[PDB]
Design a binder for this molecule. Structure first.
Ligand code: NA
Ligand code: NA
Ligand code: NA
Ligand code: NA
Lengths: 405, 405, 405, 405
């Protein structure tokens, strides 16, 4: 009846790769930090694509300026845990100059305490989400990684265990037809035109969906991701133009503050067609507001909504409402969470392959031993390693802009 | 890097009872109301039955003690066991040994959430969403957390992401708040003795009773009323307003648990700043969503009644999403290892098992060996620093095994 | 002007047949306590069918563990009444160890008093429905049976008389086409696939409906029973996929706690198509909540919602709203009620025949002289016997696990 | 087993009146307001007409006594009769003898609900849902229950499922509550004498009048105000708040019965814990649904006005479903045999037919032979233990038969 003995945390450190102060196209934790000729930068509709200079490329307006934050927590026994997110150099500042004070000297089991202190202390400048929240998440995930690594358990077991033997995935990218051949259950395509394109824009994105429906058959799901680029009327028209092809859902039509627009969009959705959002929302209380709009599925990003600790709360909010939660695809950081969620029957795999024809690891190259779906699935046994089961690729050129103590 | 801890499968589940109608009455243990003569807990307490002359003086008389204590023990293949107790007794053993065993045996000790979902899904046709069948499910869920914490060598509070406070502070429930202040509790909750059929006299008596404790206890020590489902909206509103001058902090469970619409109206009519609370008899996370939506200030599930620790953690996230507190019905260690991790449970309940509320008789006395009690109305996290829920089963109690399999 | 003299109740006794502690497939009061090769166990969608081990058979997850409760009340003149429900051995415990105290020594006319005492006294563990409520119902029905048997009147006459000369039935089972040939007005089929089956599942259950529509013509009703197995989005899609075949209603799509989901499902239903539920709800106050969701028809089970005394209140709640009530089919216990309800224009007959080709009595074999519809109807004259007009088949092997006094 | 009681058919229905504009004024009986000179019931009572100088002092002056008493008697083929009385007189006999007879004659004595539905369906084009035609229907429905109880040899209260209390306690309605306390009543309800046209003086007078009775009656004896449809929301709110300091329990019928929206607002503006009640002039169960939905605390149908005992039992279930009380307008035995069976009617009304409220003159004096009166503000169930509604018709009264058929 002798309790396992636990170390205190000795050090936290932060590095970054890519972003505006290192090397363009570093990939890793910042999905959009890619090179030339990538589907993910191919005329994707956004709040800026209405501007001729920023229509063809999201990189051009700066989708890639942040790069990847890496947070590593070191216990007094020299065991480490870490995690990666989008924030880069500014995230380093926050961790090294502010948050380190709540982290260092706590018990490795003090995760929810540190998470609470981190939210309480940054509330005056975090704005609910975005950069600061991504940084908090990255710290939360490192803490879980360390705690599992010290205990010798996968995070999914610390959470109360898998509720299914494998995760099934849909794939996000320009090639649902190729994804069907790889064994995925569905494909989510980006929209390429926006409100300023009017009926032509609706015609083109609907024709894209109609084409893939013909290529993929009736049972493979199709979805559109709209990345905050629309307004209520354009989204309504687009959803109705795609209804004949059984589009499963239409995602992130509006900027995240537009809760009232989401409520109106869901009311106007075609019967049976779901409306989703959440990947840019942050904090449990924001997801309360989002859920009450009546959207079918919230899609938090673990690396952005506040971390694993927040994600688990969001899952319970959804469950309380008899609804699914389907987190954005965040490799192992989402895998260990969703395989324990009875109300996450499937998950997302984002194509980082430039032409969506191969299975590049999602956070390539920053994670060593990073799993990829095989036949559209990741077996729970693949996740049976301590923490989130990966190691940091120290061959990437990690920059340390700040230090402390 | 490291290979995981190897975890055993679950080999056996077994169920026993003590007390209740088919054994020795007054056993105590998991059923708080399985007590002897002259207990404050049976002293003319207002109930849905107290309108009847024959059932007015005693709750025991209408049968509040018929069920007794259910004990569930789960045994891993490596011979380690975990256990828990709740109110369900003999019928509880039937549900465990003849139904739920099929979902428990042969699973991993980490498959807690999986088993939980299977128990809810398989009993949905007979569970009524709360009460006896839910108590049984809850008791199994707690046994599983116990066993898992014991196999791992960690207190459940650490597997949940750790304490967010170094100790738990307690208010005390029973007839002597004046005395509880002397034992160091932060407040005291009294039962009501009169009901709607007692009219204005009932209100005057119970309010007088509170006026007296404010006087004896000073202005800062909390006073509350527990109404055990015994009122209607009008009577409850009259009471709350009659008690407002004494700064009564909350008024608890005025209505039967189905009366959601009535709680909404009661909350709307409550004196400014006085809380209306409920939840001890609710079960299932979805019932708690409907509860939370009535606008009541505090939900109060019993961990061993609401569905288990797995459900309690969900109810906590639901309340936290709404910016509200969650304050479980005092369930000894089963609550302690939870509430110590909840940012939104700033205090907890100790329910007086002492006949005259003068002593710190343990919450689940005599069934739990080494059961912590509030030391100066506080319980420090070090006390909780033992594997699982940190207690042992008292096998000197006369455990009966009505069923096997 | 000399009033009929009435006996007091002398004894109540409880037996069970079937369930986990007697013989598999006992049938009788537990509809699902059947053998192998039965339509009613044929890949029926449920909250558990998402689990590969519990997909093909409801028996496999334990739909049949309870078996049949029999409650017999004996008056001091030695006249008996009785009734049957689903609860078995645990129901015996409740009746023999708890409820007997409110029952024994009352007047045979004291039905609503005993019913109130039974609800008031079990409120702390009944959870609103399910097992405990089924047991209360069984006692309520026995009391009505005895009272009518003593007076020498059918229950339907004690209630204020028939409002129609016969009851017309739809049939529930896998063969609406066979039911049409037997003279029923409609057939309600179970769904076989659930949310985890996606578009394929919708395609298959809709094709089942389309096939029967072709076989049965336009005026014979078709309905689907979904037995708590869906979520809002899947139910919406299924209802719209069946609208072209004029599906009359879609029943029990959601678990009974999901009132808010019912409200959203009814809003999204195809024009003219009804959404129904209620067979797993218990207590008058639960049916208030259910009615206010806007569902078209509540479908209480007399043996489960609290008894005849509660059923009659539910009928009035429906009537107050200008709506029908259509109780689940519970043989004579529903017949004597619904033939007096102006707002129950038709009733349900459940096929206990394994292949739905013959008219086995619904509670076969526990009831002697149990009527069956002839040409889809039961003439009121068939019900013109005292109480509920049947006798207990004492040749079944009734077990008495408990006794008292 | 047993052959049923053989029941006769209904052979004749016959209708008589006394009192009212076409006979001897001041007859009393079923019409409570058919009284002589100097009655408290006609003493400057506030009404919708009292704003007019000519109709201010007397209700008799505007014609509250024009209708008189309707008597319906139903005769079975075995020569047994049952009867009831209500307010409708001569026009009432026209409706019975020239319309409703066709639904009554030739039915079974048990066909109560059937006849009831037929009477509502057939008069829907001229009934206005309350008032005169509803009174007539109600009187027939009561005659049928009477006749049935008499043929069977049971009090109606036993056919309804029996008493849920051994006696009925009563508050008294009239000008001398101080005196009613002395007769043992649990409270007293006073009429208002002034109306909106009297402004602040009106309020001061009626409030003063209540301040005086609190003083004379002590704090525990209930005080209430009846406003007989005579106010508007603003005047009613001013009154309630002027009476709050005297713990006035409820304020009754402030508004004409159509003003549902106004009752909703009045209830919203009422002092905390003070009830707002209504319903005496409502008719049809659907009107009561709309009433209940305004949020008023207590609905108060008159049994002989609201549609009959059949409707009253429905209104009771509606209130009970909402967790609320139902307290009929005192209708002597017609209410007593109902309310004694309603869990949600914990007290009843005795309306003073005594000119100066000093004596226990019977409610329907002189038309009912052996009419019970509260013995010490209570009426025991043994008093009710006679067949049907337990009274006889006073044929010494000068019964007129305006119509036959
Ligand atoms: Na997205
Ligand atoms: Na409580
Ligand atoms: Na059903
Ligand atoms: Na009145």
């Amino acid at each position: 009846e002798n309790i396992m003995t636990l170390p205190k945390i000795k050090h936290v450190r932060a590095w970054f790769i890519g972003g505006a102060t290192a090397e363009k196209g570093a990939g890793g934790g910042d999905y959009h930090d890619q090179g030339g000729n990538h589907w993910i930068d191919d005329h994707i509709a956004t709040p800026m694509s209405k501007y001729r200079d920023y229509e063809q490329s999201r990189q051009s307006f700066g989708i890639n300026v942040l790069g990847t934050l890496i947070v590593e927590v070191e216990a007094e026994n020299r065991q480490t845990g870490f995690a990666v997110s989008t924030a880069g150099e500014m995230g380093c500042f926050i961790v090294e100059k502010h948050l380190n004070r709540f982290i260092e000297g706590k018990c490795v089991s003090d995760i929810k305490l540190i998470h609470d202190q981190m939210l309480g202390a940054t509330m005056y400048y975090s704005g609910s989400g975005g950069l600061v929240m991504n940084t908090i998440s990255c710290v939360d995930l490192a803490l879980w990684d360390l705690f599992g690594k010290v205990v010798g358990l996968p995070v999914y077991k610390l959470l109360g265990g898998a509720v299914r033997d494998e995760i099934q995935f849909y794939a996000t990218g320009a090639r649902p037809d190729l994804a069907k051949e790889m064994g995925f259950i569905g494909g989510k395509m980006p929209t390429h035109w926006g409100p300023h394109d009017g009926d032509a824009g609706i015609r083109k994105d609907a024709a894209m969906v109609a084409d893939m429906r013909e290529k993929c058959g009736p049972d493979f799901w199709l979805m559109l991701d709209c990345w905050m680029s629309q307004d209520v009327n354009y989204a309504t028209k687009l959803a109705h133009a795609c209804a004949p092809f059984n589009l499963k859902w239409i995602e992130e039509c509006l900027p995240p503050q537009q809760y009232e627009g989401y409520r109106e969009l869901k009311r106007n959705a075609p019967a049976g067609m779901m409306v989703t959002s959440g990947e840019h929302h942050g904090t449990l209380q924001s997801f309360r507001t989002l859920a009450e709009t009546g959207i079918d599925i919230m899609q938090p990003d673990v690396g952005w909504c506040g971390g694993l600790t927040t994600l688990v709360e969001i899952a319970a909010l959804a469950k309380s409402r008899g609804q699914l939660v389907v987190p954005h695809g965040s490799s192992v950081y989402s895998h260990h969470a969703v395989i324990t969620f009875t109300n996450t029957p499937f998950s997302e795999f984002l194509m980082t392959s430039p032409d969506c024809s191969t299975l590049r690891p999602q956070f390539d190259p920053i994670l060593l031993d990073e799993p990829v779906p095989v036949n559209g699935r990741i077996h729970k046994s693949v996740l049976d390693k301590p923490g989130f089961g990966v190691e940091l690729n120290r061959d990437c050129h990690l920059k340390r802009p700040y230090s402390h103590e």
